């Protein structure tokens, strides 16, 4: 309806990005810094200056980065590894403050909630880490029988959503109950892995989820009532969803056939734009701090930066 460029503003190169659906290899900091996991290194790229930094490189043969996530203030970076560590990195100092172990298998997903960092694993378990204290491992949430590939705290901290290659979506309370750590909800309707998980920024209890190749749907939920408010065939595995306040839209990333981004109007779920370019499947979307730009990372070893939510 308005002008949404059909091409990316910038195309960063992402050589040796690992073409593995379950990983979460890109994140955009409040400080305008893109973190990007390419095989066994993480690169930082300022969208302000254009400066590039190789933050770290794994030490051991065969080890690679399996997830990254910035802390809110953008000065520390969490990094999950194929060797089941959650490392914590001070980005200015360029030092590694912690190397937290607890998981039995690779750590593919990460989400922050203040000083609690939540980590998910190929084992199916989710761990809460109090990164301030010595015994970092303060909770275990066990609601998945296979890889936790989607993990996101609600903006208001009241809920944590997790998505799995067991095709489950769980919504966790922020604090255990009498039963201990048990989901408030468990949605079984997806028929494929659910890596795409995102909270509506302007509707507290509303969650969007997206399914893998055998599912292909985007689903919207009320996590209070348990209702599916909407299911849309996206015709392609859905790797990531973001919400945009700017125009009240969602954007999702896809693979085969067209490897496109699709922008949808909420709550009508009408298709606004398709953003073509990527020549292989999209792996991840992440959003800039001003909300104007989405970064897509794909298996064609590029990051495209789309100015698709510009204001006035």
């Amino acid at each position: 309806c308005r002008y949404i460029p059909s091409l990316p503003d910038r195309i960063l190169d992402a050589p040796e990005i690992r073409n593995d659906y379950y990983l979460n290899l890109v994140d955009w900091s409040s400080g305008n810094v893109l973190a990007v996991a390419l095989d066994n290194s993480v690169y930082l790229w300022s969208a302000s200056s254009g400066d590039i930094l190789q933050l770290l490189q794994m030490e051991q043969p065969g080890e690679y980065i399996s997830s990254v996530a910035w802390i809110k203030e953008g000065n520390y970076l969490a990094v999950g590894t194929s060797s089941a560590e959650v490392q914590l990195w001070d980005v200015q100092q360029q030092k590694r403050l912690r190397n937290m172990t607890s998981h039995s298998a690779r750590v593919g997903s990460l989400s922050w909630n203040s000083y609690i960092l939540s980590s998910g694993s190929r084992s199916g378990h989710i761990h809460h880490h109090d990164v301030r204290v010595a015994e970092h491992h303060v909770a275990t949430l066990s609601g998945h029988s296979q890889e936790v590939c989607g993990l996101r705290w609600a903006p208001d901290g009241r809920h944590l959503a997790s998505g799995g290659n067991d095709n489950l979506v769980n919504v966790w309370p922020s604090a255990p109950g009498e039963g201990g750590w048990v989901p408030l909800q468990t949605f079984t309707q997806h028929q494929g892995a659910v890596k795409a998980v995102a909270w509506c920024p302007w509707q507290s209890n509303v969650l969007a989820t997206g399914g893998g190749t055998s599912d292909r749907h985007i689903r919207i939920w009320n996590v209070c009532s348990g209702a599916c408010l909407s299911a849309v065939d996206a015709h392609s595995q859905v790797c990531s969803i973001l919400w945009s306040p700017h125009y009240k839209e969602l954007i999702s990333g896809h693979g085969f056939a067209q490897n496109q981004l699709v922008i949808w109007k909420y709550p009508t779920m009408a298709k606004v734009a398709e953003l073509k370019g990527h020549t292989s499947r999209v792996l991840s979307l992440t959003m800039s701090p001003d909300g104007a730009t989405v970064a897509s990372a794909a298996a064609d070893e590029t990051l495209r930066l789309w100015r698709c939510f510009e204001l006035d």
Binding site: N165, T213, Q237
Partner: peptide
């Protein structure tokens, strides 16, 4: 499973 990494 590598279900979502299969061709």
């Amino acid at each position: 499973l590598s279900k979502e990494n299969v061709q």
